[PDB]
Amino acid sequence: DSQIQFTRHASDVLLNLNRLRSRDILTDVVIVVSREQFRAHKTVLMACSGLFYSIFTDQLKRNLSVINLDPEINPEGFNILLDFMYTSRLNLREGNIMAVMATAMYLQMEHVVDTCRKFIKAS
Amino acid sequence: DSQIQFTRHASDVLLNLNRLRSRDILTDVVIVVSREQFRAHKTVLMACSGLFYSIFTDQLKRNLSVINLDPEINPEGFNILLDFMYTSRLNLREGNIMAVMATAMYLQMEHVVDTCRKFIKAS
Numbered sequence A, B: 001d002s003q004i005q006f007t008r009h010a011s012d013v014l015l016n017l018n019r020l021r022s023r024d025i026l027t028d029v030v031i032v033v034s035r036e037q038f039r040a041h042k043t044v045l046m047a048c049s050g051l052f053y054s055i056f057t058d059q060l061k062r063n064l065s066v067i068n069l070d071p072e073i074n075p076e077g078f079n080i081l082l083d084f085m086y087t088s089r090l091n092l093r094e095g096n097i098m099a100v101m102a103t104a105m106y107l108q109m110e111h112v113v114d115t116c117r118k119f120i121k122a123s
């Protein structure tokens, strides 16, 4: 529309959301993945994940301070996807591909799942 | 770096943050601007504004649920900048330019201030 577009604004916001997370500022949830914990902002989690969207949009689960992921979710894969959520950068490699794809399916991250598929299809 | 770049991810996150705001989901602050109120997410406000960054990063003001802006801040200009924060789209026109620039200066939004300046310089 008529409005002036700032092509760098969305990435600048995300960069500052990542800094808040690295500074533990206004984080409101702890995600427990086996023997590891990850603090995050529910608004970001919802924005990036069908699983977290379906949890927090429900008034019954909205005020939860702790989420325990299913015991078979690997912390490595969760960490890679949480970083992705806050950076737009996906660290796919040969040693993590299966763990990441499986974690993205669980988190309901369709674009990441399809990218994990293009990766297997390539080289 | 080595990581896969998702060029649409940052704008998709922002779009979903705007939907949360339009759905009054996980908003944690009310900004009072004269006879008007605006609900928002403190994390977004901090990410876009030097004024809100300096408020909420301070442990003494972090848990505030209401912010009353100075009585001379016009609600029109604040509304335009809040929409910008959540969309990357800036609605600058002839009838609002002065109000928007003055509000951006108060909110400490340097890129918007400099853009308001390029606008006066142009046409």
Ligand SMILES: N#Cc1cnn2c3cc(nc12)N1C[C@H](C[C@H]1CO)OC/C=C/COc1cc(cc2c1NC(=O)CC2)N3
Residues within 6 Å of the ligand: A046, A047, A048, A049, A050, A051, A053, A054, A108, A109, A110, A111, B016, B017, B018, B019, B020, B021, B023, B025
């Ligand atoms: N307000 C708000 C809000 C905050 N996060 N968020 C997301 C989607 C969303 N709104 C929000 N939608 C999508 C659509 C219309 C609108 C409803 O408000 O509803 C259907 C729900 C779909 C669930 O699946 C996702 C939800 C979100 C993000 C992804 C997926 N699924 C992926 O495979 C990767 C990305 N986040």
Ligand SMILES: N#Cc1cnn2c3cc(nc12)N1C[C@H](C[C@H]1CO)OC/C=C/COc1cc(cc2c1NC(=O)CC2)N3
Residues within 6 Å of the ligand: A016, A017, A018, A019, A020, A021, A023, A025, B046, B047, B048, B049, B050, B051, B053, B054, B108, B109, B110, B111
């Ligand atoms: N964590 C976190 C976090 C959340 N929001 N946010 C912002 C900047 C920021 N970190 C955060 N910085 C900037 C720098 C290093 C780092 C310190 O963490 O510190 C100096 C402070 C500057 C204040 O001015 C701004 C602050 C933010 C955004 C803008 C301005 N000033 C503008 O004129 C338009 C944009 N948001």
Ligand SMILES: [Cl-]
Residues within 6 Å of the ligand: A048, A108, A109, A110, A111, A112, A113
């Ligand atoms: Cl995705």
Ligand SMILES: [Cl-]
Residues within 6 Å of the ligand: B048, B108, B109, B110, B111, B112, B113
């Ligand atoms: Cl700015």
